[PDB]
Design a binder for this molecule. Structure first.
Ligand SMILES: [Zn+2]
Ligand SMILES: [Zn+2]
Ligand SMILES: [Zn+2]
Ligand SMILES: [Zn+2]
Lengths: 195, 195, 195, 195
DNA sequence: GGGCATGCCCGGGCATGCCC
DNA sequence: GGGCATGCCCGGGCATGCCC
């Protein structure tokens, strides 16, 4: 399938993503490495992503998430839930990797041409006095799942899009869904330093 | 379910919550830690919460209370009474965690969209010469109840809302419902200091 | 409810129960203490019980299992699944504690007078050259479950009964359903020796 | 599901299984440990099993093969192909673990009561001057496949059955389907000696 | 109020298909 | 064939309603 752009596009609204701290304890549920721009998280647990903007987006703006493989040689393959976690799946079709929890207006899409999956929620401006809005994503496979990601790293691309379809902002982060997010983040940062 | 705001909003009326002293004796029925902004109380016993405001709110103002899980990964789950304390329950539906005692005008609500529970009483201005009004809450499960809170900490969010539905003030506090509130408060304060 | 007999009755068929060895490693799935005549096992995992007899029972013989509380003061209370594990239960009614896995002819009974639960399977003589037959029981609550056993020890009574209803043999064993069967068996044997 | 007998039954025909030597080189395709009575083989590759008997069985005799889990706590679960290798499967239904290659008279069965899978071929007496007959089995999942065997050891039970359905002989062997059969056999034999 | 209970948490380390 | 991978196993120890 055709490859969506992953290139950062901060646009005129100064769109940026924020992530909590939660540190590097062995199986913390979700931890983000700024050095690697990489979230590390457990399957089927909340991943909070914050949306920051410099100016208010117009009414009807939507926030899309889609996963693509990071490596050149996998980039044209659609990222999907492996057959085991699809089967004993359960709103979200069981073939989608990324879900949003807690949003009565979530739309799950399958592109009719590229067959790529995405999940979309409306943009809501932060609470009357606050600095960002948070969306709760869930990844429903480990990166290692045989017959899904199969140990291939992915990027999640978050785009902010007006109701006309215009791209307003785009940012992406690498994701590793694993049993021990603290162990693995520390290992990868230390590999970056040594190698 | 969508997550209600927990962010403190003191608003134009200077809404604030007050709590008694009762100190830290092992099984005091209730005790509040200002250091941790946290209530330690026993199940099905009164928890006095005082409402302070700087100016009188308009007539028809209502005070709502609602529990949400504190940790990111539980935040989208609705807080409910466990099945044991619901079954041998008894005005308040048996699935609600928080009750108000002693208020002939109490309303128990289940949001038709979020399915979250709340309990609401009208705002009454303090007695002709007094400084705050007190509402008597009861929590009907221990934080540890298997199949309800399951040891997950909760926040109680108190909102002051006009009869039109406008948010006038909001404050929240963490709650631990346990058998020995004095032991546990002391333990947590001491954990805060060392760790 | 009236108390069923727990008294060992070896009868004319020389009915006796046998149990595997599996030793005392911390969370072994099921381990039996001959010193205490006590099986220690995890919830919803197989518990193999072997049936030994000196002479062949007649055709139509059935093997019943029923749980009763061990302590005098609880003996008249019916042993049942707690409300949490009944609710998210699922052949076996969700109120029964003991199930049999793997037996197309299992009958679950609720006594119309005593309201006690039992599960019954036909007696099958051992395989053409073998020494006992094995039935795979499952206990669907921990002994500690709040609103079910509530930390009260139970006995499981196994009776061998002819198709006319006559009691042919009866033996019983104490059960503790817990998260760490190896830890707990060792602890109890050591308590027996010291105290 | 009810558990089939795994007990060796050499019967009146002196039925026994034979296995090649192929030694312990790291990724040999198949290798058999007589010490552990265990087959170590790669997925979807031939596993030769020889059938030896002391007297010729009558005409119409059939040889059935079936997998059951070895550990007590898994024994009542039906052994099946995981969803990944079933989906991209392909005579043999894609849910069966064990196939026979090279036998125009193979029957694949699913028991209507136990739902267990088996594969059956007719017994052929050895070639006019030979000592055993060989059947070529294939296992279509690794023992480690997530959502199939999931790292649980299995036994393969081979039964020799007359055309009337009578059991004539039965023998079983443990199987580990893995990427490196020579490594793993050596490792397990060495674990047996020390531990 | 001092202290046991017991399902769960926690980091050290095995697993095993794959990489090199 | 030597060695990394990464979900899981494992025992030491915290938890917290209850016992004493
Ligand atoms: Zn998966
Ligand atoms: Zn409760
Ligand atoms: Zn239970
Ligand atoms: Zn497989």
């Amino acid at each position: 399938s055709s490859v969506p752009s992953q290139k950062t596009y901060q646009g005129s609204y100064g769109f940026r993503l924020g992530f909590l701290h939660s540190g590097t304890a062995k199986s913390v549920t979700c931890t983000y490495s700024p050095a690697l721009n990489k979230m590390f998280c457990q399957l089927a647990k909340t991943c909070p992503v914050q949306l920051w903007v410099d100016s208010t987006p117009p009414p009807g703006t939507r926030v899309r998430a889609m996963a693509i493989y990071k490596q050149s040689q996998h980039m044209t393959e659609v990222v999907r839930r492996c057959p085991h976690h699809e089967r004993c799946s359960d709103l979200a079709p069981p073939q989608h990797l990324i879900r949003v929890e807690g949003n009565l207006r979530v739309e799950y899409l399958d592109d009719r041409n590229t067959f790529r999956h995405s999940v979309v929620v409306p943009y809501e401006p932060p609470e009357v006095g606050s600095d960002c809005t948070t969306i709760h994503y869930n990844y429903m496979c480990n990166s290692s799942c045989m017959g899904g990601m199969n140990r291939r790293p992915i990027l999640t691309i978050i785009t902010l899009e007006d109701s006309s379809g215009n791209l307003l902002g785009r940012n992406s982060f690498e994701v590793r869904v694993c049993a021990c997010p603290g162990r693995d983040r520390r290992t990868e940062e230390e590999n970056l330093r040594k190698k």
